Amino acid sequence: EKTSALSLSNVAGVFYILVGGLGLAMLVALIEFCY
Amino acid sequence: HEMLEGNERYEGYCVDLAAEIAKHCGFKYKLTIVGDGKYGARDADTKIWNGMVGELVYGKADIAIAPLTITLVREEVIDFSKPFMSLGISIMIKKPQKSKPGVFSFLDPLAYEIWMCIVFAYIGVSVVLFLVSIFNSLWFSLGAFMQQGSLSGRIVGGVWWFFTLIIISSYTANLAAFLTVERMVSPIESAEDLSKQTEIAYGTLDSGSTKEFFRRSKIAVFDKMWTYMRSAEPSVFVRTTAEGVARVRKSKGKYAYLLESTMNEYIEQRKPCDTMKVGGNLDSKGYGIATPKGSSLGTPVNLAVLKLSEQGVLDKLKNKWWYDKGECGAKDSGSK
Amino acid sequence: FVRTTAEGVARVRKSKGKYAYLLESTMNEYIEQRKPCDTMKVGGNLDSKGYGIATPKGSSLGTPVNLAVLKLSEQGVLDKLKNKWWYDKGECGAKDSGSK
Amino acid sequence: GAFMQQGSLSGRIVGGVWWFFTLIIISSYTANLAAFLTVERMVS
Amino acid sequence: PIESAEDLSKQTEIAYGTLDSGSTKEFFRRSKIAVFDKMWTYMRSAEPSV
Ligand SMILES: CCN(CC)Cc1cccc(CCc2nc3ccc(F)cc3c(=O)n2-c2ccccc2Cl)n1
C-alpha cells in the first residue's frame, strides 16, 4: 500500500528556477534605473 | 453457582436445548459434566474412547447433548442426530479502518518540509515587489499574489506563476493518488484472497480438526494455504483457542485466525468487540446429539431435533446466547 | 409472489433493481454463475437445513449409505463436487468477480 | 465582483486567505473526482 | 495482461483454447498442478467450443 508520498528532493527543482528568476529580476531592475 | 444445586447450576445453549429435548420426549434428565473432556476421540495404541462419546459406549451416560462434531469415526460407535446447528471453518481478523482524521493530516501529501518551504517563497516574492517598483506595498504585493502573479516586475510574476502552478498541480496530482490507492482496499476479502498475499499472516490451531482439514485437502486454494502455513516461520500456530483469539487482537490487524463459524461468531459478540467474522464458511459440517447405538431414545430424539429446526426453535436458541445476551449487541447491526 | 421458480428469476432481471427474491442458497449460488451474470447472493442464510439421501426404512442400504456420505465430506469430495458443478462448470467465473 | 476572480491592507488578506481556501476545495474536488473515475465500486 | 500463463487463467474476457487432438490438449488433462488444472476445467466447459 503506497503511501507514495511527495519528494522534497524533486520539489527543489522549481525552487531553484524561481530564485533564479528572482536573481534575474534584480539584474533587470538595475538597468531600468540607469536608462 | 455455590448457593444453587442441581440442573439449574448451569446455563447455556445446550442447557436450554436439554429441556426442549426432554419436553418433546418426556424424561427426567440430569446434566452431568464429562470427567476428562476432549469431546470424543480414540487412542492409537489402546483404542479406548474418552470424553463424552466414551460415556455413551460404556453406558456411563444415556445421551450426549453438546457441540459435538459429527465425524465419521464417531458415527461408527454412536448414533448421531441430524444437525441442530450448521457451521464451518471461518476467518477472524481485527476491526479495520481505525484511523485517522484531524488537522494534522491536513498537511500530508505536500510533506511537512514543503508547507514550511512554500512560505519562504511567498515572502521572498513580496519583498522583491518591494524593490522593482511598507503598508501599501505589502498590500500591493499581496494583491498580486491572489491573482496569479515595468520589465523588472513582469518577470517576477511570470516566474512566480510557474512556481505556484507546479505546486498546486503536484498537490492535486498526489491527492488523487492517496484516494485511488484507498479505493482498492480488500477490505474484507474472501478466503482465497487471504492466501494470495503474505503481508498479513494467518494460521490455525496446532492440534485439531481445523489443521487436519488443510492437510489432506486436494483443493488448490486450500493446498496453497497449507503449503504456506506449514513452512511459515515464525510459527503461525497457537497452543490453545484462547491464544489464537488474543493473538489477532495484538497484531495491529496483521494476523488472522481460522476456526469454526460458531466459535468465531461468539467472539464477535463479546468485549472488547474488536474481532469480526469475514467471508463465508470453508467446509460443510454441523453439531449433533449422540446416543448409544440401539437405544430406544435414538430415533425419537432425532425426530424431535427436526421438529425444533422447522418450528423455528433452533434458530431462536442460536440468536439468544449469541446476539441477545451478547455484550456487543450494538456492534452487530450497525457494523456495516 | 410468483408461479414457478423460473418466473422468480426473470422478474428480478426486469425490475431495474427494485425487486428482490428469496430462495435456497444452493439455487441462488448457481444462478449467480450462469449468464448473463446479473444476479447475486447477498447476506448470510436465514435458517439451517440441508439435502439428504433417502432410503426406505429397514432397508439394507440404509446404514452403509449414511456412513458413506460422512466419508465423502471428510475426504473433501462433496466440497470438490459442488465446486466443480457450480463454479468450475459455471459460465461467469469465480475469478470474473474478483477484479478482471 | 471580487469572488469570481479569485479573491488597502485589510482587504488584501481577506482576498488572500479566501483564495487559499477555495484553492484547496477546487483541488480536492478534482482529485477525488479522478479517484471515483479510476476505480468503480459497486454499492450493495 | 502481463506476459505469464497464470495471468491468462485468471480472466475470461480474452478466451483461450488448444488443438482438438494432440499432446497439447492431453497435457492440461492429467496435469496435477494448481495453475494448469484451472486452465483445463475452463477449456473443458467453455461454450462455445474454444
Ligand atoms: C485515510 C488514510 N490516510 C492515512 C493517514 C491515507 C492518506 C495518506 C497520506 C495523505 C492522505 C491525504 C491527506 C490530506 N492532505 C491534505 C493536504 C492539503 C489540504 F488542503 C487538504 C488535505 C486533506 O484533506 N487530506 C485528507 C486527509 C484525510 C482524508 C482525506 C483527505 Cl483529502 N491520506
Q: Concatenated DSSP letters for B274-313?
A: -EEEES--SS-EEEEEEEETT-TTHHHHHHHHHHHHHTTH
Coil, strand or helix at C27 = helix
Can chain E be said to touch chain A, i.e. do they have 3 or more Cβ pairs within 8 angstroms? Answer: no
Tell me which chain B residue has its CA closest to the CA of residue C76: B217
- Sign, CA torsion B325/B328/B330/B335: negative
The answer to whether B79 and B290 are in contact (CB under 8 A) is yes
B to E contact (≥3 Cβ pairs closer than 8 Å) = yes
**Residue D32 CA, closest ligand 1 atom number:** 32
Burial C43-82 (b: 16+ CB within 10 A, else e): eeeeebeeeeeeeeeeeeeeeeeeeebbeebbebebbeee
- Nearest-atom number in ligand 1 for the CA of A5 is 9
Sign of CA dihedral B250, B255, B256, B257: negative
Among protein residues, the one with the nearest Cα to ligand 1's atom 6 is B178
Nearest to B259 by CA among B223, B206, B333, B331: B206
- In the chain, the amino acid numbered E17 is G
Question: What's the rounded Cα separation, in Å, for the pair B69 and B75?
Answer: 10
Cα dihedral value C17, C18, C23, C24, nearest 10: 40
**Half-sphere exposure of residue B11: CA atoms within 13 angstroms, side-chain side:** 5
**CB-based contact (8 Å) between B217 and chain C?**
yes
Give phi and psi for D15, each to the nearest 5.
Answer: -75, -15
Residues 239-298 of B with CB under 8 A from C: 283-286
- The annotated binding site of C for L-glutamate is made up of 24
Q: Are strands B201-203 and B255-260 parallel, antiparallel or unpaired?
A: parallel
DSSP state of B64: E
Q: Angle of helix D10-38 relative to helix B151-182, nearest 10 degrees?
A: 40
Say how far apart CA B64 and CA C92 lie, in whole Å: 45
Euclidean distance between CA atoms B62 and B290, whole angstroms: 9
Compute the CA torsion angle B290, B294, B295, B296 (nearest 10 deg): 120
Containing domain of residue B24, as a range? 1-94
- Other C-beta atoms closer than 10 Å to the C-beta of B137 total 15
* Residue matched to cell numbers 491468462: E8
Q: Which of B97, B103, B178 to mutate to test the pocket of ligand 1 (most atoms within 8 A of CB)?
A: B178
The residue whose grid cell reads 459429527 is: B70
Measured CA to CA, the distance from residue B92 to residue B265 in angstroms comes to: 9
Resolution in Å, one decimal place:
4.4
User: Are C74 and B72 in contact, with CB atoms under 8 Å apart?
Assistant: yes
CA-based R_g, chain C, Å: 17
Give the three cell numbers for residue B280: 463465508
Other CB atoms within 10 Å distance of the CB of residue E48: 5
Q: What is the CATH number of the domain that holds B62?
A: 3.40.190.10
Count of alpha carbons within 13 angstroms of residue B198, beta-carbon side: 10
What distance in angstroms lies between residue B333's CA and the mean position of ligand 1's atoms? 29
Show the ligand 1 pocket: residues with CB < 6 angstroms: B 100, 105-109, 175, 178, 182; D 24, 28
Q: Which atom from ligand 1 is nearest to the alpha carbon of D27?
A: 20
Dihedral sign computed on CA atoms, order C83, C86, C91, C93: negative
Residue reference for cell 436458541: B317
Give the span between the Cα atoms of A13 and B286, in whole angstroms: 66
Helix/strand/coil for B268: helix
3-state secondary structure of C80: helix
Go through B255-269 and write b for each residue having 16 or more CB atoms within 10 A of its CB, e for each that does not.
Answer: bbbbbbbbbbbbbbb
Q: Which of B14, B37, B140, B75 is CA-nearest to residue B292?
A: B75
Longest C-alpha distance within chain E, in Å?
28
Rounded to whole angstroms, what are the CA distances from B195 to B185, B271, E12?
16, 29, 21
Grid cell for residue B20: 426442549
Cα C49 from Cα B310, distance rounded (Å): 9
Residues 6+ apart with CB under 8 A from C88: E41, E42, E45
Method: X-ray
Query: Nearest-CA neighbor of B296 among B70, B15, B63?
Result: B63
Query: Cα E2 from chain centroid?
Result: 16
Give the whole-angstrom CA distance, residue C11 versus residue E49.
Answer: 31
Rounded to whole angstroms, what are the CA distances from B198 to B24, B158, B229? 52, 51, 11
Residues B32 and B45: their CA atoms lie apart, in Å, by 28
Element (H, E) at B42: strand B40-42
Hey, what amino acid is at B234?
P
Q: Is B140 exposed, middle or buried (0-12, 13-18, 19+ CB in 10 A)?
A: middle
Question: Which chain B residue has the Cα nearest residue E36?
Answer: B220
Q: Which among B133, B121, B131 has a CA at the least distance from the CA of B159? A: B121
How far apart are alpha carbons B297 and B317 in whole angstroms?
A: 23
What angle, 0 to 180 degrees and rounded to 10, lies between the N-to-C axes of helices A8-34 and B151-182?
170
The whole-angstrom separation of Cα B72 and Cα B91 is 25
Residue in E13, E42, E45 closest to C100 by CB: E13
H or E element that contains B68? strand B64-69
Which residues are paired to B51 by β-bridges?
Answer: B40
Å from A35 to nearest chain B CA?
A: 13
Alpha-carbon radius of gyration of chain A:
17
